[PDB]
């Protein structure tokens, strides 16, 4: 059971818009983009369509660290919901789609299944928090929030959360869990 | 001078064909797709003209460690010469190219200047080495191989080749050239 | 590159109790913090052989094996470079050299460690300490009362070290590093 | 997890002179070993206290501070667990215990390393060392009396750990770093 289910049922991808940080993020999402980065950000946009397609834009951007000297870093994913969406709702049992690197027309599939695993809405019905994972624990996860910092609690409660999801209670420290930089940016 | 100059001129692309095995590379080839990558290898499927468009085609394989266990990596590249190429001729002054992440019939550009900076050829007139690279040392630079590894000599005089084409000579050592692990694959 | 001390006219008699790491430079992992969790120092308070006067330092983490969590203590011994009379318990700048210690053995490790900067609240005691070399690339170390500090807190504390002198480059990730202070049971 | 010894009734006599750290596990890191390349244990060969035997190592390596290179140097020395008989120069196991010395102090840091592998060139001299613990993730060092060795030479090194009880896994990248040889005065 190192299979991870999600939390956050029933997901208005309408209020998916607009900045989040990047807090916190396991090994295998330095992969792609990830590596040196610092004062990571996901600008994603609201929800679109193209016909039956729900998808949203994310423009991610940081300061990649190339230790003599840090270069601005900007790539544009589109996140396409898996299941046709129809026009009547923009809610959706689970958010589960496939991640796209996309560059004018041109677009290429990086992962087939990316979930929204939990989002925490605060007083306005908008997203605070949000957990992206595949259906395993070794699959790139990405912990991002309204804010570039969080207390303790929240963190631990984010943390607490990749648990009750079914992450290995060993794979939430620093080795596996790397902390995005946030601070000057 | 800063910039990092082609050694290597009057190329005959008709023979960039084979497997190169990854000997090493420097630490900004792994912010794209080298990150965790032991057993690096690199097909090329040599000269494809499309008219007066000259290109090539790289099937990019390595065993990608997420520490708990290797999975095996698969993806393609296309090397299209930034010149144009006449139908007589399979020779080009320098190999400049630019460099496409390509999925069925998409591609996405990557890189405008990746440049053949060094190439070893044997009597039988084809690579033994290759040096690829951009025009300064922070752009990824890899270092590949007829064979999966290569004695001391040989590789004191790659890195030679690069002091020579104008890679700064400070960035030659560990931190910044990472020998790729080619044991047991 | 040269650092000089902020703090001035720092009371030793109350450099005791636990300080947790909260960050560090990449060259304070060379001797015993490398892959440390939860690094914390208990310090002695002021002791004196007569007109020397030093402290003691039970350094403690749980170092990460990628499998598991090995607990980790070990002592150190700061001596106080200049005699300090049996007059007062206050030196113009704390300058030191750092021992391991280990029974009755002591090993000299560097013979300049300084408090840069330290905080005092109103009980006159120390809310956070930056002990550091003489060279910005020496061994820099960021502890506080606290085991996790606001972003607030820690702008203080870099901004800081930027008037002690180290390079505002090396004040980000690459070069500080925050020590992973969470699940600490 | 646990090692036995493969090289029974090795003579200490000839544990002199300069060996090559050709690799290392992420473990022996943790103290010396970080950031180091060109890494170097001169053996001062068998020495005697009556009962006790002894051996010095005098380790240096170029230790990389990202911004240029000092030279590291420091002095251990391997007392035998079961005492020596000053008839005989040949024990049945080499299992000893490493301090770090510095004049007349030494600071005891592992009282269980042991030779679990030496290969006897035809002077009937040791070509290539194993050290390590009873445990595959206590520090481990495969040293040879020339800077590089041969793939055949490698997978026969490697294989004598699977041998003596490490697990498969343990044996490839992250687990076992190759030091850097290259450009060492
Ligand atoms: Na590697
Ligand atoms: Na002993
Ligand atoms: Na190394």
Same mark, same amino acid.
């Given at each position: 059971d190192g299979v991870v289910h999600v939390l956050s049922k029933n997901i208005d991808v309408?209020?998916?818009?607009?900045?989040?940080?990047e807090i916190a993020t396991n090994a295998s999402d330095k992969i792609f983009p990830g590596?040196?980065?610092?004062? @990571?950000?996901? #600008? !994603?946009?609201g929800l679109k369509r193209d016909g039956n397609l729900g998808?949203?834009?994310?423009?991610?951007?940081?300061?990649?660290?190339?230790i003599f000297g840090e270069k601005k870093s900007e790539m544009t994913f589109k996140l396409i919901?898996?299941?046709?969406?129809?026009?009547?709702?923009? @809610?959706?049992? #689970? !958010?589960?789609?496939s991640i796209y690197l996309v560059q004018?027309?041109?677009?290429i599939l990086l992962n087939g299944n990316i979930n929204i695993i939990y989002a925490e809405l605060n007083e306005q019905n908008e997203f605070e928090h949000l957990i992206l994972g595949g259906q395993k624990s070794i699959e790139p996860?990405?912990?991002?929030?309204?804010?570039?910092?969080?207390?303790?609690?929240?963190?631990?409660?984010?943390?607490?959360?990749?648990?009750?999801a079914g992450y290995e209670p060993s794979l939430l420290t620093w080795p596996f869990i790397i902390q995005?930089?946030?601070?000057?940016?």
């Open positions: 309408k209020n998916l818009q607009g900045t989040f940080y590596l040196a980065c610092r004062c @990571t950000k996901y #600008e !994603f946009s998808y949203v834009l994310i423009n991610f951007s940081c300061a990649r660290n190339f919901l898996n299941k046709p969406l129809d026009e009547n709702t923009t @809610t959706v049992e #689970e !958010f589960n789609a004018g027309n041109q677009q996860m990405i912990i991002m929030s309204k804010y570039r910092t969080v207390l303790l609690d929240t963190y631990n409660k984010l943390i607490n959360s990749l648990y009750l995005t930089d946030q601070t000057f940016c």
